[PDB]
Amino acid sequence: AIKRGADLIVEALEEYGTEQVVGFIGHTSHFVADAFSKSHLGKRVINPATELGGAWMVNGYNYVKDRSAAVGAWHCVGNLLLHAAMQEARTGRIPAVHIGLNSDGRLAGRSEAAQQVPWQSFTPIARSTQRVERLDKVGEAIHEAFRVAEGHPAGPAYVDIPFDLTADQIDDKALVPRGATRAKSVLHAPNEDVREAAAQLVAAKNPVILAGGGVARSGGSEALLKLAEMVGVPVVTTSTGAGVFPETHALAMGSAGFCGWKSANDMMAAADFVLVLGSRLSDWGIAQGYITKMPKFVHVDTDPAVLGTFYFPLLSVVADAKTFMEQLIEVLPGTSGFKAVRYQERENFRQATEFRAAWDGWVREQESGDGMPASMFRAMAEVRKVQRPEDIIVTDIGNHTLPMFGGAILQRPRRLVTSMAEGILGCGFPMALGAQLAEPNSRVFLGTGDGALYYHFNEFRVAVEHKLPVITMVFTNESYGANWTLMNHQFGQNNWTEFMNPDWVGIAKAFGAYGESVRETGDIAGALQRAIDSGKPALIEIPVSKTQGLASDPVGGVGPNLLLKGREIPVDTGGSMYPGENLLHLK
Amino acid sequence: AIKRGADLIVEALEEYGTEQVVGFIGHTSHFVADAFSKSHLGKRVINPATELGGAWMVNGYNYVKDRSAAVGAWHCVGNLLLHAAMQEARTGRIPAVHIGLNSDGRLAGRSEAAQQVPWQSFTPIARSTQRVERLDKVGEAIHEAFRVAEGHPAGPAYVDIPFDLTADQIDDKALVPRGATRAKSVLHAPNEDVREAAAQLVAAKNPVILAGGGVARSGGSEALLKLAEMVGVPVVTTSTGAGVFPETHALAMGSAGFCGWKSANDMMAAADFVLVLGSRLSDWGIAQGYITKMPKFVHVDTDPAVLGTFYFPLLSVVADAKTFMEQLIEVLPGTSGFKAVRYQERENFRQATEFRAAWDGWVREQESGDGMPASMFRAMAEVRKVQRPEDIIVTDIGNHTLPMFGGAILQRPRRLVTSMAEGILGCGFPMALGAQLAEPNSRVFLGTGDGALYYHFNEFRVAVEHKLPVITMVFTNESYGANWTLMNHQFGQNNWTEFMNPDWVGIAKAFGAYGESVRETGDIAGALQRAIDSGKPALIEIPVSKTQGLASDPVGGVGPNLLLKGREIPVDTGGSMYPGENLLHLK
Amino acid sequence: AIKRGADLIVEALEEYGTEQVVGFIGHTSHFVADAFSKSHLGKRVINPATELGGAWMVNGYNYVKDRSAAVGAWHCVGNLLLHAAMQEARTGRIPAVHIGLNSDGRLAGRSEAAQQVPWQSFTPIARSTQRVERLDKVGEAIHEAFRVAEGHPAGPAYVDIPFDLTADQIDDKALVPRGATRAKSVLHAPNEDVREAAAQLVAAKNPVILAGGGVARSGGSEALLKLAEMVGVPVVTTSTGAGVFPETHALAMGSAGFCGWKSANDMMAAADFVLVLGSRLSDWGIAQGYITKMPKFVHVDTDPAVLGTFYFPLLSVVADAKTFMEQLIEVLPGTSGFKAVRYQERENFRQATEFRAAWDGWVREQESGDGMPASMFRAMAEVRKVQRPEDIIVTDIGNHTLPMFGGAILQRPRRLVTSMAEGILGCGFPMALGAQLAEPNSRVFLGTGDGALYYHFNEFRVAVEHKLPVITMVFTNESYGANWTLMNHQFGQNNWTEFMNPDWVGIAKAFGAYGESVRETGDIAGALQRAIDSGKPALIEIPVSKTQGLASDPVGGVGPNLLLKGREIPVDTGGSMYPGENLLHLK
Ligand SMILES: Cc1cc2nc3c(=O)[nH]c(=O)nc-3n(C[C@H](O)[C@H](O)[C@H](O)COP(=O)(O)OP(=O)(O)OC[C@H]3O[C@@H](n4cnc5c(N)ncnc54)[C@H](O)[C@@H]3O)c2cc1C
Ligand SMILES: Cc1cc2nc3c(=O)[nH]c(=O)nc-3n(C[C@H](O)[C@H](O)[C@H](O)COP(=O)(O)OP(=O)(O)OC[C@H]3O[C@@H](n4cnc5c(N)ncnc54)[C@H](O)[C@@H]3O)c2cc1C
Ligand SMILES: Cc1cc2nc3c(=O)[nH]c(=O)nc-3n(C[C@H](O)[C@H](O)[C@H](O)COP(=O)(O)OP(=O)(O)OC[C@H]3O[C@@H](n4cnc5c(N)ncnc54)[C@H](O)[C@@H]3O)c2cc1C
Ligand SMILES: Cc1ncc(C[n+]2csc(CCOP(=O)(O)OP(=O)(O)O)c2C)c(N)n1
Ligand SMILES: Cc1ncc(C[n+]2csc(CCOP(=O)(O)OP(=O)(O)O)c2C)c(N)n1
Ligand SMILES: Cc1ncc(C[n+]2csc(CCOP(=O)(O)OP(=O)(O)O)c2C)c(N)n1
Ligand SMILES: [Cl-]
Ligand SMILES: [Cl-]
Ligand SMILES: [Cl-]
Ligand SMILES: [Mg+2]
Ligand SMILES: [Mg+2]
Ligand SMILES: [Mg+2]
């Protein structure tokens, strides 16, 4: 059948499992938008206030789904706004396909052409960058994009299509590849390696299991619970793994790292052996700026590139996390020295429970005291009273990240969302909208700084039109508070940190969202109830200090090195000069 | 003397003429912010709501200054938001230096590193991209950046500096290059080329002088007035040249092009010879999608690359525009066939005056729409009543661009501002703030669509804190009106074009800006008076139709070909298959 | 201890298993060469006539070793010659680390600098490209290079180090990472998948096992022999897999593809099921220009990227080839319908033996006839009389490739060497020298075209000095014979194909190599004996036809499409013009 390139693009997106399109109109995307209006997918399209806001929605949706279920489709120059969100998708392992409709291929390369997008700008960012030259390659290019995006590692794929090809027509026989294939992901470890891990767990006096985001991607919660109880070993997570182990369990230490729980950092410092499952031991994660000292450890991952790049394990294993845990459960009875004992009776139990109890007591101290300014830990204690296991916690980047992570107590995977890998400010609100679109049965609670909310609050138009009832707490301190705090310490003076806020209640109301301030009332609990009952997106203005959180609260961190110290560097030797130095010797 | 890298950066920026810093804080920019606080540039640093908003401010400031007077200084991952504004600076010939402070060079290249910015993403966009490896190269790199940015062609330079080098210290002897000078820019044409151009001008029956943005950069307004009056030749401009010739003059036809004045398009269609001065004859400028038919023409530019790339001149000349005009003025009396006659008595005068009268009559007809919705041409007629010769007109991108360009009547150069080269939506409000910073005592009037204002209205924070009294008219139609209208024409249906507005007056009030709607009154005149009286940034909501402007108003354009018609393309031949086609051959 | 960067580079190369250095001197590699002279590795350095010749030696060495045992070390501008060999290493899956010593980092970025190598030229070619900015990163960068080079997929890594860092000194504590870690590669398939493969083999009426180069990397020869005999299934290879199954066995069909054995192409055309092990089903391999029709197939590979990119399998499996075969051997007794029967008694045996017998008879016909010009198949029959199982066959690219592949009958893996993935002319002689260096106990026989030998015969100085007794047959036809033959057919006329040869015997003798021509004697057998007995590198000049081989001999191929047919393409529509077309409408 004769088909337009635009129709073929939409067919290919349908073929590879697309559910949610985030699209922006312009003449180069006109044919694609018309094709979508005639398709199943057209029913769900989101048109964001800006392309970067929309790209953040794609990231939030796909982070919680672990596949490229959301896709971007963008008119030429709007692709120029994608880079920040695309970078997070790369290092944060978020599958995400973006289709850019460039200007006419006839005009490409002319020096005075308008809107000829430099697609090569994405080469260092996307895991796959393709410029489509020919109409008969559109299906093929989209097929490749999904294959790369949904691999190990997951990440973004960008496809640049000059828009004349979307208007052009061709016979469609076999053009869109049908019935795309996939190998099982349940990669099994060699039995020798499973035996070695079991022997190390037995021998250890105070072992820990460290579960990262790969346990979530693997679907390994059930196996992890069975394993941890069988051996009686405390469980630490990364921030993307939090919730794969119920965080109310006696063996739950929480997340290690600089915005994590002190119980987890205490356990990592005490442990004589770690079993690492599905973690990349990253800079702003377990490595803490490449300062953390790891105990001897076994490292199990599906991506060989993460194994041994920086921390050299005792034993490295390429395997699926769930599968490896199941193999270990089978081998343990039978391992020399293993005995079945209730975890509460193991010799290492008291230590771990003491670490957790000390952390819980400190958290309760931070929750104490009503009135203003509010403690962000108290705000999260109020959320917990109305929070269900399926509900999602979102944060932005700042002082506030630490209380959001410390007050999030999670029972299911993929319930904690931010720009994890790159710490890109402004992510929180649009990622929360993407997560809400993906998980319509979840309540989504966002704790955002004021400096953060400034970026993409224009997306309230999406939240209101599409009935996405995110509950946003905007923590106001009229500052980039992490930076105020750190610069005061570093230099004795903050600079570039202070700003004015609008009346955020008035902003919300101007969009038809629910708005309430607790500046005068302190009534966080009531505001949450009213926000929830409204059925609207909501904004609750909560004054906080400039200093509470990341830059100040002690959680047992060792890094990263935000307050780097300079070194005195020698000048160059040899006779070569600086530019312009000729004039100093005589002109 | 031993100095920190951050201090050396500030010294280099001061040496090369920086007047205004737009900066965003984070740990990687802490030392640079601290160093700026010790400089006279500190007192008035602009900290924008987002880095892309700030990069648009840099563009607006530098467009009106014709040098890199404003500079950007950005914490690592915030650099990822620069690309759209940087692309406009490249093709739009806006000098602009951006300093990106990357993460620690010690950590660069580690696969699980956080915030290691891919500076190579700028290579296809900036005119100069440099990664500084060594502290002793910081002065040298900044010297190079200004050299490239302020050359011919002008454009953006990006300098990536790992922030450890900003904390490190070194002896400073000769390190910052001092006393840089440029060659004079007053390039003279060969006398024979001047004589040939004079002979063509005098021989032509219906000549035109086409003056582009290069006449503004050259400072050629006085020479252009003398030349046009001496020979009695109508003047057409590009949109960046508008205002170099007073647009109230009898010989002023206005700007040619698809959002220009019909008088100019009429004149270009009638002309038998064109003298092109300081224009690149671009796609969305004079070329109109490479459809415009140029008469025989002489082409004078400082950049050899624009001469003969697409339109082949009768004679190409490398020269400064002002200088070439002065040369021509000198040779005209000695040119056979030249006679000194008042311009009003030349044979070609009546034709040109008829074209201008017909255009002016059409514009007047558009000023009497006079209901709700209001006419955008009426809004500009009201602006003109309170507009001085030094005041600046800004627009965004949409249906509204055409009435903004058509209602702008200018007497001085560099008074019309937008994303000229790339048409990037959202530019208008932050570019207007940048222009206002550059010229504190000029009045700045912005006409913006609603879809456009959605992008960067977060920068009201800057406008209110810094008391930048930009007068913004938001034209409301609850749509991307150009797209609504044109899709209805192309397909019989529009898709992706409609959205809800907030209460824009309420948004302004929530920020502390002046806000008023004329929906019930039509009182644009009174709203402008009250907005000006306020002394604040102002937002005036003006309801408009979905269709008025670019999509519906004929101005004699021929292109560009954006509603392109597809072609039927043959399938490939030979035996090669599509991916997945193997399955189709199984029996 | 205080160490120079040069000393640290050599320590790191030793740490990660380097055996063979191929290095080229110049001031930027002076410190590195001095450091090598004080190391174990210095004893084995090869200094090639050119850097591209040396890079081909690295490829030949590492192709046969399956690890980056050979490394390149190059003075600045000599790195500019690496790209061709580096590209083969990428697509041909050859591990290969190259260390480039650039010019002084102080001078980098200066516009009029000499010998500042553009290392970014390698970004699209190497699997890893690193520019080292800091002395304390030299060990780290080299560690990363080996990790990427020796992964799945294997490939080249390039490290660019400004040479000042090689002269600079630093305390060495912990700087070179010690005890680099690695996971086992014996990846096991899910038992369900092994069961499915067994069920498909049972059900099939005339199955085939297709073994590629991954079976060689895996070390799977023993398992493949046991499997093939147990099920009684014919074995086809790719050209990099040839020799993993003894090619004198009754079940050996040889290599499929356009330069392969007709018995293998016949079997692939007849088969109702294929088990593909360790093949990427490549363009100039099994795909034959994406024309080959695959029967339903199971595809087993360690690299998920090759699985389903173009040919969609019935079942895709991520597993090590040897391991998967061992799993299959265990499950087969017990699979419904499996019965133990001698392979000679299976119903499918006669068909396969008939295909092999027909091919062998055709090969014997091509060997018949002595005298001149010689048949290249007869030359290979003469080699076979003096060829041991450990010996290596090398070819270059041309008509001659087909008889080299068809006359190579191999019993062990990694005995067939060329530029497999990219077909880069000239590879053969230097790859043969690299293979000889790696396998000093092998006799190495090269069959090279004359056009090919012209490239790197300058490397005879290496062969003679280092006593590398490669036996080279130069097939003379005074032509690029593949192109003469194909162009005569395509156009009726050859162009750019003919050239003169030197007296190749005189060339060999001028280098101190053994030289002999059979132009007058026809005595191939005697020349081989004399060449072998000389103990020198040898060159035997053998006249051949312009036409025999790739471009003419029928081996059952279907592609690739060398003689592509053009299509008539429509002109563009719309009014836009070509550059310069303005002058045709009136100037
Ligand atoms: C301000 C801020 C503060 C932060 N604070 C912390 C903190 O305190 N603690 C913290 O941990 N992080 C923190 N982060 C997040 C951190 O930067 C990283 O994003 C995070 O630690 C990475 O998690 P991960 O190691 O589990 O790997 P992920 O990025 O989640 O990647 C998944 C890993 O699992 C592997 N994998 C995927 N699927 C499977 C499978 N089926 N089986 C096996 N392996 C699989 C992948 O190959 C990869 O190695 C912070 C971020 C910011 C911006
Ligand atoms: C929605 C939209 C509608 C538009 N409609 C129009 C329209 O109707 N008409 C129109 O003209 N544009 C229009 N534009 C703008 C257009 O895209 C270009 O930005 C503009 O036409 C370029 O102007 P220019 O040719 O004068 O060159 P500029 O981009 O202003 O560049 C300056 C030129 O002068 C040269 N130069 C610089 N200094 C000197 C010197 N000292 N002496 C000599 N030469 C010098 C430079 O080398 C260069 O060639 C539109 C843009 C948009 C987004
Ligand atoms: C002139 C010319 C003619 C040619 N003619 C032919 C021809 O007739 N026939 C032919 O076959 N080729 C031919 N070639 C070579 C061809 O271009 C390819 O180089 C070759 O076919 C690729 O072999 P392969 O598919 O086995 O994969 P390789 O390139 O050998 O790659 C190895 C594959 O095995 C996988 N792998 C690696 N280790 C393991 C492991 N442990 N377990 C499982 N999988 C593993 C890899 O991921 C990869 O998919 C020709 C080349 C030229 C230049
Ligand atoms: C795009 C971007 N720009 C700047 C930063 C630097 N940064 C990190 S945290 C932070 C403070 C954010 O302020 P806010 O959201 O108010 O949070 P607070 O620190 O006050 O809790 C900043 C500016 C960043 N990470 N990303
Ligand atoms: C970043 C970006 N995204 C999308 C577009 C495509 N575009 C061009 S004009 C336009 C309409 C803008 O709407 P508005 O500002 O309301 O103006 P109107 O057409 O209603 O006058 C759009 C979406 C663009 N040029 N840039
Ligand atoms: C670098 C390079 N240049 C050119 C070619 C194209 N090419 C492929 S085969 C061939 C013929 C080589 O001639 P020769 O070595 O004499 O072999 P013959 O065809 O005569 O057997 C040529 C020119 C190539 N593959 N690589
Ligand atoms: Cl547009
Ligand atoms: Cl940050
Ligand atoms: Cl040299
Ligand atoms: Mg804040
Ligand atoms: Mg609008
Ligand atoms: Mg030849």
JSON list of N, CA and C in Angstrom, two decimals, chain A residues 394 428-429 431-437 443-446 460 463 467-473 514 531 535-539:
[
{"chain": "A", "resi": 394, "resn": "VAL", "atom": "N", "xyz": [8.64, 11.88, 44.69]},
{"chain": "A", "resi": 394, "resn": "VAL", "atom": "CA", "xyz": [9.53, 12.57, 43.76]},
{"chain": "A", "resi": 394, "resn": "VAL", "atom": "C", "xyz": [10.23, 13.70, 44.52]},
{"chain": "A", "resi": 428, "resn": "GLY", "atom": "N", "xyz": [12.07, 17.69, 38.81]},
{"chain": "A", "resi": 428, "resn": "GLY", "atom": "CA", "xyz": [11.11, 17.03, 39.70]},
{"chain": "A", "resi": 428, "resn": "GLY", "atom": "C", "xyz": [9.66, 17.14, 39.25]},
{"chain": "A", "resi": 429, "resn": "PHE", "atom": "N", "xyz": [9.17, 18.35, 39.00]},
{"chain": "A", "resi": 429, "resn": "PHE", "atom": "CA", "xyz": [7.77, 18.53, 38.61]},
{"chain": "A", "resi": 429, "resn": "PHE", "atom": "C", "xyz": [7.42, 17.75, 37.30]},
{"chain": "A", "resi": 431, "resn": "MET", "atom": "N", "xyz": [9.09, 15.23, 35.81]},
{"chain": "A", "resi": 431, "resn": "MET", "atom": "CA", "xyz": [9.23, 13.79, 36.05]},
{"chain": "A", "resi": 431, "resn": "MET", "atom": "C", "xyz": [8.04, 13.25, 36.83]},
{"chain": "A", "resi": 432, "resn": "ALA", "atom": "N", "xyz": [7.53, 14.03, 37.79]},
{"chain": "A", "resi": 432, "resn": "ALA", "atom": "CA", "xyz": [6.36, 13.61, 38.57]},
{"chain": "A", "resi": 432, "resn": "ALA", "atom": "C", "xyz": [5.14, 13.47, 37.65]},
{"chain": "A", "resi": 433, "resn": "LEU", "atom": "N", "xyz": [4.95, 14.40, 36.71]},
{"chain": "A", "resi": 433, "resn": "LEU", "atom": "CA", "xyz": [3.85, 14.29, 35.75]},
{"chain": "A", "resi": 433, "resn": "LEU", "atom": "C", "xyz": [3.99, 13.05, 34.86]},
{"chain": "A", "resi": 434, "resn": "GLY", "atom": "N", "xyz": [5.22, 12.74, 34.42]},
{"chain": "A", "resi": 434, "resn": "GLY", "atom": "CA", "xyz": [5.44, 11.52, 33.62]},
{"chain": "A", "resi": 434, "resn": "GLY", "atom": "C", "xyz": [5.17, 10.25, 34.42]},
{"chain": "A", "resi": 435, "resn": "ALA", "atom": "N", "xyz": [5.61, 10.23, 35.68]},
{"chain": "A", "resi": 435, "resn": "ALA", "atom": "CA", "xyz": [5.33, 9.10, 36.54]},
{"chain": "A", "resi": 435, "resn": "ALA", "atom": "C", "xyz": [3.83, 8.94, 36.77]},
{"chain": "A", "resi": 436, "resn": "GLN", "atom": "N", "xyz": [3.13, 10.05, 36.95]},
{"chain": "A", "resi": 436, "resn": "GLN", "atom": "CA", "xyz": [1.67, 10.00, 37.14]},
{"chain": "A", "resi": 436, "resn": "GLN", "atom": "C", "xyz": [0.97, 9.43, 35.92]},
{"chain": "A", "resi": 437, "resn": "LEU", "atom": "N", "xyz": [1.40, 9.84, 34.72]},
{"chain": "A", "resi": 437, "resn": "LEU", "atom": "CA", "xyz": [0.84, 9.31, 33.47]},
{"chain": "A", "resi": 437, "resn": "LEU", "atom": "C", "xyz": [1.04, 7.83, 33.34]},
{"chain": "A", "resi": 443, "resn": "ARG", "atom": "N", "xyz": [-0.92, 7.71, 43.97]},
{"chain": "A", "resi": 443, "resn": "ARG", "atom": "CA", "xyz": [-0.73, 9.10, 44.36]},
{"chain": "A", "resi": 443, "resn": "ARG", "atom": "C", "xyz": [0.76, 9.44, 44.24]},
{"chain": "A", "resi": 444, "resn": "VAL", "atom": "N", "xyz": [1.04, 10.62, 43.71]},
{"chain": "A", "resi": 444, "resn": "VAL", "atom": "CA", "xyz": [2.42, 11.10, 43.45]},
{"chain": "A", "resi": 444, "resn": "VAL", "atom": "C", "xyz": [2.63, 12.33, 44.29]},
{"chain": "A", "resi": 445, "resn": "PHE", "atom": "N", "xyz": [3.57, 12.25, 45.22]},
{"chain": "A", "resi": 445, "resn": "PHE", "atom": "CA", "xyz": [3.96, 13.35, 46.11]},
{"chain": "A", "resi": 445, "resn": "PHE", "atom": "C", "xyz": [5.34, 13.86, 45.70]},
{"chain": "A", "resi": 446, "resn": "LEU", "atom": "N", "xyz": [5.40, 15.14, 45.33]},
{"chain": "A", "resi": 446, "resn": "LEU", "atom": "CA", "xyz": [6.65, 15.81, 44.98]},
{"chain": "A", "resi": 446, "resn": "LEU", "atom": "C", "xyz": [7.05, 16.76, 46.10]},
{"chain": "A", "resi": 460, "resn": "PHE", "atom": "N", "xyz": [2.18, 23.15, 34.67]},
{"chain": "A", "resi": 460, "resn": "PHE", "atom": "CA", "xyz": [0.88, 23.07, 35.30]},
{"chain": "A", "resi": 460, "resn": "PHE", "atom": "C", "xyz": [-0.23, 23.02, 34.29]},
{"chain": "A", "resi": 463, "resn": "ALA", "atom": "N", "xyz": [-0.72, 19.37, 33.75]},
{"chain": "A", "resi": 463, "resn": "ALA", "atom": "CA", "xyz": [-1.28, 18.71, 34.93]},
{"chain": "A", "resi": 463, "resn": "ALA", "atom": "C", "xyz": [-2.80, 18.98, 35.05]},
{"chain": "A", "resi": 467, "resn": "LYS", "atom": "N", "xyz": [-5.54, 16.18, 34.01]},
{"chain": "A", "resi": 467, "resn": "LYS", "atom": "CA", "xyz": [-6.07, 15.68, 35.29]},
{"chain": "A", "resi": 467, "resn": "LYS", "atom": "C", "xyz": [-5.04, 14.74, 35.94]},
{"chain": "A", "resi": 468, "resn": "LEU", "atom": "N", "xyz": [-3.84, 15.29, 36.15]},
{"chain": "A", "resi": 468, "resn": "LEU", "atom": "CA", "xyz": [-2.72, 14.58, 36.78]},
{"chain": "A", "resi": 468, "resn": "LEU", "atom": "C", "xyz": [-2.55, 15.15, 38.19]},
{"chain": "A", "resi": 469, "resn": "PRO", "atom": "N", "xyz": [-3.16, 14.51, 39.20]},
{"chain": "A", "resi": 469, "resn": "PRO", "atom": "CA", "xyz": [-3.32, 15.17, 40.51]},
{"chain": "A", "resi": 469, "resn": "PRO", "atom": "C", "xyz": [-2.08, 14.98, 41.41]},
{"chain": "A", "resi": 470, "resn": "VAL", "atom": "N", "xyz": [-0.92, 15.36, 40.89]},
{"chain": "A", "resi": 470, "resn": "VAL", "atom": "CA", "xyz": [0.32, 15.38, 41.68]},
{"chain": "A", "resi": 470, "resn": "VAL", "atom": "C", "xyz": [0.14, 16.33, 42.86]},
{"chain": "A", "resi": 471, "resn": "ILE", "atom": "N", "xyz": [0.59, 15.90, 44.03]},
{"chain": "A", "resi": 471, "resn": "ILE", "atom": "CA", "xyz": [0.59, 16.71, 45.23]},
{"chain": "A", "resi": 471, "resn": "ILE", "atom": "C", "xyz": [2.01, 17.26, 45.42]},
{"chain": "A", "resi": 472, "resn": "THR", "atom": "N", "xyz": [2.19, 18.54, 45.11]},
{"chain": "A", "resi": 472, "resn": "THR", "atom": "CA", "xyz": [3.48, 19.20, 45.19]},
{"chain": "A", "resi": 472, "resn": "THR", "atom": "C", "xyz": [3.60, 20.05, 46.44]},
{"chain": "A", "resi": 473, "resn": "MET", "atom": "N", "xyz": [4.63, 19.77, 47.24]},
{"chain": "A", "resi": 473, "resn": "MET", "atom": "CA", "xyz": [5.07, 20.62, 48.35]},
{"chain": "A", "resi": 473, "resn": "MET", "atom": "C", "xyz": [6.24, 21.46, 47.83]},
{"chain": "A", "resi": 514, "resn": "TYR", "atom": "N", "xyz": [-5.18, 23.38, 42.74]},
{"chain": "A", "resi": 514, "resn": "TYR", "atom": "CA", "xyz": [-5.41, 23.67, 44.16]},
{"chain": "A", "resi": 514, "resn": "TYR", "atom": "C", "xyz": [-4.16, 24.32, 44.72]},
{"chain": "A", "resi": 531, "resn": "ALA", "atom": "N", "xyz": [-5.75, 19.06, 49.65]},
{"chain": "A", "resi": 531, "resn": "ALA", "atom": "CA", "xyz": [-5.14, 18.89, 48.34]},
{"chain": "A", "resi": 531, "resn": "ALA", "atom": "C", "xyz": [-5.65, 17.57, 47.70]},
{"chain": "A", "resi": 535, "resn": "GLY", "atom": "N", "xyz": [-9.00, 16.63, 44.14]},
{"chain": "A", "resi": 535, "resn": "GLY", "atom": "CA", "xyz": [-8.85, 15.86, 42.91]},
{"chain": "A", "resi": 535, "resn": "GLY", "atom": "C", "xyz": [-8.04, 16.58, 41.82]},
{"chain": "A", "resi": 536, "resn": "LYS", "atom": "N", "xyz": [-7.45, 17.73, 42.16]},
{"chain": "A", "resi": 536, "resn": "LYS", "atom": "CA", "xyz": [-6.68, 18.52, 41.20]},
{"chain": "A", "resi": 536, "resn": "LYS", "atom": "C", "xyz": [-5.18, 18.31, 41.45]},
{"chain": "A", "resi": 537, "resn": "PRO", "atom": "N", "xyz": [-4.33, 18.67, 40.47]},
{"chain": "A", "resi": 537, "resn": "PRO", "atom": "CA", "xyz": [-2.94, 18.95, 40.85]},
{"chain": "A", "resi": 537, "resn": "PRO", "atom": "C", "xyz": [-2.95, 20.02, 41.95]},
{"chain": "A", "resi": 538, "resn": "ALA", "atom": "N", "xyz": [-2.02, 19.90, 42.90]},
{"chain": "A", "resi": 538, "resn": "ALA", "atom": "CA", "xyz": [-1.99, 20.79, 44.07]},
{"chain": "A", "resi": 538, "resn": "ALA", "atom": "C", "xyz": [-0.62, 21.33, 44.33]},
{"chain": "A", "resi": 539, "resn": "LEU", "atom": "N", "xyz": [-0.59, 22.53, 44.90]},
{"chain": "A", "resi": 539, "resn": "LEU", "atom": "CA", "xyz": [0.66, 23.17, 45.31]},
{"chain": "A", "resi": 539, "resn": "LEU", "atom": "C", "xyz": [0.48, 23.67, 46.74]}
]
